[model samples]
Target: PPRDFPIQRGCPFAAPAEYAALRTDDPVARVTLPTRREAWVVTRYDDVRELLSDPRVSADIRRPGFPALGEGEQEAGARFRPFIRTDAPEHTRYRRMLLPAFTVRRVRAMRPAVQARVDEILDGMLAAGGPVDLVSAYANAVSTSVICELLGIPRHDLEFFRDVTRISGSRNSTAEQVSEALGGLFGLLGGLVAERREEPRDDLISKLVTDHLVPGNVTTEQLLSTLGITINAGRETTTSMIALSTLLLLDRPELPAELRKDPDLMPAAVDELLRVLSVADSIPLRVAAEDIELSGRTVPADDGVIALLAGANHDPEQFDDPERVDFHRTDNHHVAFGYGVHQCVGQHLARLELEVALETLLRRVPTLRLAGERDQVVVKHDSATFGLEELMVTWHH
Candidate 1:
């Protein structure tokens, strides 16, 4: 029997060990998703990138073979049709609309804004002092505040957003939790859309409402889902990175010591961590549009395929001694961000956010350490992204 898809990581800091054997032995292997739907997953560095870059693959959720991880994802994906799950022209139009704010020049210019937010978050966390859930107090605040304000969504509590994604996205969630989350998210977005229509504001939200929405370019549902996914996607990925990177640093003292030795290494360190975590590992889901040959194997037309990005990022063929994290690792062009047309547009912003968040935390909270035993830390393997559920940290007063 084919192994189940999304093989769990034996350790938090690494990809599934099975990827190594699969990359060498069966570059394109079959596995059953949580949905019990079978599909092909490419584990080789070249094959993963090549599969994603190929236009012959379909990212459309409507495709009978699009390999979503589970039924909840498949159901929500088909109904909402997030831009990340759609094809050209449609995907292109929506992406173009939101692309301006995330460009390197644009995101670079916002570093002060990002820095200010991170610092303020640290200020609050530091004032409270010692033994706090960094995931909620620091990481979540930094990500939730920056993206929500930057995108012009009204400031709502991070707890609210977390519950929305947490309960709604989880397999163990009750129907009541799901309903409240779904209702709350859409209810807020719908009201915002209605507000923007009657009165224009000088922000992205209003620009979207005034330009595309009010003019009848896209329906309210399309606009709402696009906004919903963007908010949830941007916040969750960054939040995961910040919390996980901090935990990794806390667990391994030497990594931070090296960074303190040379402060300029933060950017490279951030990139290295991104490569190491690859939190959004299997996000690049596709269905082969035609017969496509890869690494001596062929996936039939319309068959589902997922580019195992963590598998690619961890392949020894790509990275030397793939298990070790080196701050100075060169040629570090890993696809923590996906490859091709649907690649992450907000990545530049994400890089800036991580650099600021991690560097600031290191420099400011010089005494920061894990507040609990290693065994007590809860690592979430079930989310679409890999991350820590709770990370308790404290520093000497």
Candidate 2:
């Protein structure tokens, strides 16, 4: 009986302007989701962290009160049981199996490979000439290619995976449609997983199959879902980050210029961008397993709740001049990567991707600018993730 959830952002750099009022007046507010389900949205920094890290709160999707934005997510999630939506011990088991590949040390070593791929992509753009669609030509291309390298899949198979994510992640897609999309994805992955078991490789799929599958710690279905989420969740978030972060830098020329002047600021700038954008703001959805007190209000047991990362990261108490994108901002422990057990597993790899993707573009294409009027830029609002639909950018060769 409150307001319809404010998923739509008033601007690219900030969360729904409504979030400011909510954070100040009603830290934990209830609203109806698109699916017609009511859930609580936590808008304060302390509340978000407190709720996410609490054991009394559950991440399991099967819970009736789990706050999924789309029926597709609720149905598909319950069906696939993606480990991201599953609770500890079981979730911990899957996470531990995948941890070695994404460790900071491993990701650091991958920087050279990432840089090479980014350069290869920029080379194609440079040769093609200006007035190119940035999202398709660069953002998604770099995002998908890196993920392709990690999963040991061919880049040629791009559309198939995207098709799967499109159908399975849509709010309009029925349970049947979601099931069909995932079926095709799992089918293709089944083949790769089988081959990997017979001959292990240095990639994630091979490592997972050898370490967990062949040993029978996980079933084929579990493995397929894990890989699917890795592809769907990781790809979408990183793609959005790259595209939107670039848009921010381009829109505010001085920002990118600052990074170009001091290359060392790129990492902090990327983090600040993540904090500013919070593209996957509502990614972490959960249910109260038991009565929990938050901001002096109790989210009674079994109620659905979503932690708005955008809200928490922008809290004045946590971040001074919160909306100002400052690379030198100190103590930036933003929850852009969620808080507790289910925090983003691919975060290190994602950070590396953003750094290379953005830094390379700025460094190589010094004259990069919008190809069309600023108003022509399409901002995507319907998808689970927030990002620009298309941004046409050109550069002097």
Candidate 3:
């Protein structure tokens, strides 16, 4: 029997964490992908992390004839940003420049703003008092606004930026749509750079344009690319995480109750959420830098190893009771953010924003409940990060 096309067939199925929980240690399985390519999937945490840090693996997707699926425009649209499309050296320099701004101290200083945005969004949703799509009303509100403020983008441009990011982040978007989204984002970034040039501010855009922009040369392109990466990195990933984390909390209502009782548990809970449902199913695609043997299988130097991050995180050998969402799980050494040099630079900031969003959300409305049946909610297909397309929720205190 052959495996399913577009998604895995047996254990560690596609779409949700439940399926991933089932196939914890099915090391080195082959899948007949929609791309008509045979891919070797790795599903163990140790190997995933090691492979992530291994210089032997490549993040570069432009390795000949490899179209980024969907449409030509979308493939071309993706070419605009260099970091997400490149590996090491360049990846290292770009990542290093942004690290200072995302440190624990910086993200901590931004907490007040994060909480404020969450409060305002919650107020609007609570005022409506009807079944509301949390994705549009709350999750987008907090994550988008925080990221915007961090980049020093004006409040008015948020709607435009949000639209561009939503379209680009969408898993279901057609190749053309993805391209249009990328173009729109680049267009918006161009305007931001122009504005910052006229009037400097203490935001990231100004810093990059002023400090790093190599005047009359790579300056403008560098400026636009930096903003593009910041929003690309910060917005949708956090948005998806918010929806998944909230859904997980709702599934285990007692956990939310406990979190409400002890506010401090929010941080650990956020980490656990990241560990359990970290969105990496569609993230890693590696062409073996050299022939390597992992988990008793030989990967040809030409063979690409696609590490299933969510699959690895839930590996039973790697985590005790991998199915359970132990918010307080002390042994959580998750690679939800990748590892080593390529580890997500904005992880600490993401954590701070998530903690604030969760705390403020629950604090504002203690009786919040899901607006519809969980099973009816849709998860985007072919996305590196998994999230509900629409999360309906409401509450009145």
Model 2 weakest lDDT span, ten residues long = 162-171
Number of the top lDDT candidate: 2
lDDT of 1 at 129: 94
lDDT of each: 0.83, 0.85, 0.69
**Which pairs of residues collide in candidate 1?**
none
Encode model 2's per-residue lDDT on 1-397: one tens digit a residue.
6778856786887888999999999898998988898999899999999999999999998888989888677775547677778886888888888988788987887789789878988998889896998887888878877876788765555544743454365446576777777666677678889988886777889989998898898888788878877787787778889989988988898888799789999999889999989988888899999988999677889999999999999999999999999999997989998999988889999999999999999889988889979877789877777888788989876
- Candidate 2 yields a Cα-based lDDT of 0.85
TM-score of each: 0.90, 0.91, 0.86
117-221 per-residue lDDT for model 3 (tens digits): 677777777877887888777777777788776787776646556655655655565866777777766776677777887767867777676667736534576
- Residues 272-339 of candidate 1: C-alpha lDDT, one tens digit per residue: 99988889888888999898999989999999998888998898888988779998897687999989
Whole-model lDDT, candidate 1? 0.83
CA RMSD, predictions in order = 2.7, 3.0, 3.7
Candidate 1 vs candidate 3: the lDDT winner is 1
State in Å the error of residue 125, model 1. Answer: 1.5
RMSD of 3: 3.7
